[PDB]
């Protein structure tokens, strides 16, 4: 189990002003550190966030968090469950800022809620440096869904933080799972019906921050562009491995697709082709032709394969590449055009 630590700086808070925190399992024989960002959509105005506080309060508050959590998937210490990094130091950072990990705004006389996701990541890193992270060789910032987009928004800031604090030997890398979306035409709840508005409004509500090189490309008012992987990824300097199902369930929900006649068949095939196209120049990626959402902390994440290579193997090959490799690929994108045309897709 990973044990809870509430942040010592109690001014870095979840939405309702309670302290943020992290769950930690130390591995003193390892110089590898995995920091995983939880997902779970977001909220973008007073009324929307009030609803989330009634029925999704663990995503807005630490008041009811458990003492411990079990590591699963890439967070498991069992080699049978985690062929990739079973001996690493494991950190789970709960998502309690409702801001896709972008916010830097405190509660105040003018703000009902605090949106501090970007500052929560900075403070966790900061406090871990006193608990052994100072001796790390690799810091892998990973995350799923909104946490996967959060990796893209924060990996270069963590790298800059560690350089400025005097730790230039720690190699910062990112792993973004199910956080790579298309701002495409829909097939036919504002957060699902009108996604780009929801992001634009959220950024202003959260005082949200995007990576500087991307911000400079799109300029004032157009920061929402940097929440889309194919637009922010080319501006990043840290190595980033991208995991994305080609027919992602959250993408299809936003597109108003529910599972088929010709119009919908053509729409679904075109979505796979467009996602494939955006990954063509991403050298470290894993994109199976399946209808699903998230993978890296699922216990059976070992089962899916692309061209005969599993995701744990592809990540191991990526480690080797950062020291093409014969028999050990890092770029794995399905070419077949319909969900579950890959036999290893999950049921
Ligand atoms: C605690 O965090 C807040 C928000 O980032 C910051 O203003 C303050 O300086 C921090 N306190 C300490 C002692 O680092
Ligand atoms: N934005 C929000 C806040 C409170 C309750 C529901 C929603 N809507 C929603 C739609 C799809 C997936 C998750 N949430
Ligand atoms: N979930 C989704 C799917 C397809 C298009 C837009 C969204 N919205 C979104 C919100 C924050 C960050 C990235 N995307």
Curated annotation (Swiss-Prot):
One of its GO terms (cellular component) is endoplasmic reticulum lumen. Glycans are attached at residue 9. Rarely expressed in adult normal tissues. It is an enzyme of class 3 (hydrolase). Its EC number is 3.1.1.98. Induction: Up-regulated in hepatocellular carcinoma (HCC) with high intracellular beta-catenin. Carboxylesterase that acts as a key negative regulator of the Wnt signaling pathway by specifically mediating depalmitoleoylation of WNT proteins. Serine palmitoleoylation of WNT proteins is required for efficient binding to frizzled receptors. This is Palmitoleoyl-protein carboxylesterase NOTUM. It comes from Homo sapiens (Human). The gene is NOTUM. The chain holds residues 88 to 451 of 496 of the full protein.
């Amino acid at each position: 189990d990973l044990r809870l630590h509430l942040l010592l700086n109690t001014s870095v808070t979840c939405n309702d002003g309670s302290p943020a925190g992290y769950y930690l399992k130390e591995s003193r024989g390892s110089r590898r550190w995995l920091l995983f960002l939880e997902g779970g959509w977001y909220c973008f105005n007073r009324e929307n966030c009030d609803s989330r506080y009634d029925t999704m309060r663990r995503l807005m508050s630490s008041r009811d968090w458990p003492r411990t959590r079990t590591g699963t998937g890439i967070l498991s210490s069992q080699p049978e469950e985690n062929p990739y990094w079973w001996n690493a130091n494991m950190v789970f950072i709960p998502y309690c800022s409702s801001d896709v990990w972008s916010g830097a705004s405190s509660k105040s006389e003018k703000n009902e809620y605090a949106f501090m996701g970007a500052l929560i990541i900075q403070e966790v890193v900061r406090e871990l440096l006193g608990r052994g992270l100072s001796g790390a060789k690799v810091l892998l910032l990973a995350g799923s869904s909104a946490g996967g987009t959060g990796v893209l928004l924060n990996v270069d800031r963590v790298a800059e933080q560690l350089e400025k604090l005097g730790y230039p030997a720690i190699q910062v890398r990112g792993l973004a799972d199910s956080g790579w979306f298309l701002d495409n035409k829909q097939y036919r709840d504002t957060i699902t019906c009108a996604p780009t508005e929801a992001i634009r409004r959220g950024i202003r509500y959260w005082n949200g921050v995007v990576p500087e090189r991307c911000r400079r490309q799109f300029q004032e008012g157009e920061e929402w562009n940097c929440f889309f992987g194919y637009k922010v990824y080319p501006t990043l300097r840290s190595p980033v491995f991208v995991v994305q199902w080609l027919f992602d369930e959250a993408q299809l929900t936003v597109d108003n697709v529910h599972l088929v006649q010709e119009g919908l068949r053509l729409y679904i095939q075109n979505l796979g082709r467009e996602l494939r196209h955006t990954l063509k120049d991403v050298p470290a990626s894993f994109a199976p032709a399946c209808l699903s959402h998230e993978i890296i902390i699922r216990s059976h994440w070992t089962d899916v394969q692309v061209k005969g290579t599993s995701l744990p193997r592809a990540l191991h090959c990526w480690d080797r590449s950062l020291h093409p490799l014969k028999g050990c690929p890092v770029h794995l994108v399905d070419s077949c055009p319909w969900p579950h045309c890959n036999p290893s897709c999950p049921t």
